[PDB]
C-alpha cells in the first residue's frame, strides 16, 4: 500500500530493521545488491551478520526466512506453513528446478499454499517445472567460503528436521 518507506527513510532505521524490511519485501536478493541498497556507509561484516539472521543462502543468493513471512499469530498454524516453505527452499539448494507435484506430495498442503511457496522465489517454465528466480551467484560463493560452509551446516540442521516430519526421497 501507500505505507512503503523510501530508501532514505529506510536508511535512518537501525541496520537490523533495514535488512529485515528489504528482505521481507524483496524475498530473494544477491548480497552485492543488498550492500548497494544499504549504501556505502555500512560495513560488510555487519551485513554478513545481519543477513543470516533473516535469510538463508540458496543458490548463492539470500532468501528471506519462512518465519518472517509466516510469523506466529492463516488458519493453518504458522509452523506448518514455515515447514512447507522450508522444504521448497531446501529443494532449491539442491537444484534450480523443482517439480510442483513433488512439493504437493511431500508437504500434503493445499495447492494454493504450494503455489505461494514456489512463486515467490521461482517462476514456472514450460514443461520443465519451477526455476529458481535468481542466477547462481558464484561470485558471492567464491568470495565468502566461511559463510557458505556455515550456511551448508545450517541447511544440514534444517534438512534433518524436514526428514523427521516429512517423507523425503
Ligand atoms: Zn524455518
Ligand atoms: Zn492456507
Ligand atoms: Zn506476491
Ligand atoms: Zn550446501
Numbering used by the authors: 264 to 336, 342 to 437
From the paper:
Pol III is a multi-subunit complex composed of 17 subunits. The TFIIF-like RPC4/5 and the TFIIE-like RPC3/6/7 subcomplexes are Pol III specific and can be regarded as built-in general transcription factors that play a fundamental role in Pol III transcription initiation and termination. A notable exception is the subunit RPC5, which in metazoans encompasses a long C-terminal extension (RPC5EXT, ~450 residues long), whose function is currently unknown. The RPC5EXT is formed by two consecutive tandem winged helix domains (tWHD1 residues 259–440; tWHD2 residues 556–708) connected by a 115 residue-long flexible linker.
To gain insight into the structure and function of RPC5EXT, we determined the structure of its individual domains by X-ray crystallography. Of the two tWHDs, tWHD1 is the most conserved while tWHD2 is absent in Caenorhabditis elegans and Drosophila melanogaster. The tWHD1 is formed by two juxtaposed winged helix domains that form a compact globular domain with one of the two recognition helices, typically involved in DNA binding, buried within the structure. The compact conformation of tWHD1 is observed also in solution as highlighted by small-angle X-ray scattering (SAXS) data. Thus, one possibility is that, analogously to A49 tWHD, the RPC5-tWHD1 participates in an interaction with the upstream DNA and bound transcription factors, thus stabilizing the human Pol III PIC.
